[PDB]
Design a protein around this ligand. Structure first.
Ligand SMILES: [Ca+2]
Ligand SMILES: [Cl-]
Length: 360
């Protein structure tokens, strides 16, 4: 029962993607996904028929401890992530791989160097990011899972691989950033490079990207993490986009975004989207309709301003349904299930058709 306006002039090759990084782990535990009718189907088939054409997957180097026990949060190591990307690309999907260059979660508040990279000197570290990235993408290419797009680090606002690439050390930061890129192009120079940033502070994007472009860092896409309840209003997003299309001749992408289809909880583990508090920040209400309205408007806002540089969006945590063992951390539960595009029973929400109903 979801009402939605079409987006006039929206290209058929527009990136209407989702981040399904947690899905592979969920399926291994016995988690099941159901289509609009509520019958059990292949997840990728459910996404495709709903209009999703791209898949985004994060990759951690070694999300396990010295005892072999997994960290959690999907346990997104290269072998498990590559197997899903292979099946997705086999089903026609486009693939964006997000190398966090960390053993676990990375964002502008934490950018841990992997356990084996921790005490490598800077020169040895440059040799590490290159050789790992090269072999990483060489691994995916052979399982027929070469990603169309690569994302050098996740939300690298304050840099990555701290402290050696802590943005403060801009010179070293650029060396490591370039080193990874050199690796990607050596595997295939038609793979597109994605620089991912969080927030919609336009004046920061200017300062950061200008210094990046001037440093010789070659990339194709400027990716954005936009969570309205954190980063600002729809208008704040509009101002960022138009500022990027005028100042830069590069593509504009939303690497991460999400909203709440409900406020309830399923597994007893409190969610990030918890109270009506975040609901007044987002400007949209926490219903299945409110979720869909936000997504359609984000696609519209991006294209109406992005013009021919508008690339598309990825809905983050789309497949993160509540399931025992598939929490955000080993031993803990799910804080995101009320922001997925599936309900607690694993059934596709009627707002999943937003990636298809934006057309006409
Ligand atoms: Ca929960
Ligand atoms: Cl430096």
């Amino acid at each position: 029962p979801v009402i939605i306006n079409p987006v006039p002039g929206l290209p058929v090759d527009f990136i209407r993607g989702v981040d399904a990084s947690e899905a592979p782990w969920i399926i291994e535990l016995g988690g099941k996904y159901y289509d609009e009718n509520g019958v059990e189907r292949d997840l990728l088939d459910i996404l495709k028929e709903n209009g999703v054409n791209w898949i985004r997957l994060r990759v951690w180097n070694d999300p396990y401890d010295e005892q072999g026990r997994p960290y959690g949060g999907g346990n997104c190591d290269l072998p498990r992530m590559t197997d899903f990307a292979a099946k997705a690309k086999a089903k026609g999907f486009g693939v964006l791989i997000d190398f966090h260059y960390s053993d676990w979660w990375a964002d502008p508040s934490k950018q841990s160097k992997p356990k084996a990279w921790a005490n490598l000197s800077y020169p040895e570290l440059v040799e590490a990011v290159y050789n790992w990235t090269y072999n990483a993408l060489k691994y995916m290419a052979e399982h027929n899972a070469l990603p169309d797009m690569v994302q050098i680090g996740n939300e690298i606002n304050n840099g990555f691989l701290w402290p050696d690439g802590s943005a403060a050390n801009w010179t070293q930061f650029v060396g490591l950033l370039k080193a990874a890129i050199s690796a990607v192009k050596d595997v295939n120079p038609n793979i597109k490079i994605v620089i991912h940033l969080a927030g919609v502070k336009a004046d920061f994007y200017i300062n950061f990207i200008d210094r990046l472009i001037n440093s010789g860092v070659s990339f194709d896409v400027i990716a954005i993490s936009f969570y309205p309840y954190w980063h600002g209003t729809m208008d704040d997003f509009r101002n960022l986009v138009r500022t990027l299309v005028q100042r830069y001749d590069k593509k504009i992408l939303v690497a991460e975004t999400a909203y709440a289809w409900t406020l309830d909880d399923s597994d007893g583990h409190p969610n990030i989207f918890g109270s009506r508090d975040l609901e007044v920040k987002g400007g949209y209400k926490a219903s299945i309709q409110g979720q869909a309205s936000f997504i359609r408007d984000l696609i519209a806002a991006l294209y109406e301003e992005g013009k021919d540089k508008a690339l598309g969006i990825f809905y983050w945590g789309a497949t993160w349904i509540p399931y025992p063992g598939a929490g955000w951390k080993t031993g803990e539960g799910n804080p995101w299930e009320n922001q997925a595009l599936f309900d607690f029973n694993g059934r596709a929400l009627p707002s999943l058709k937003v990636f298809r109903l934006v057309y006409e």
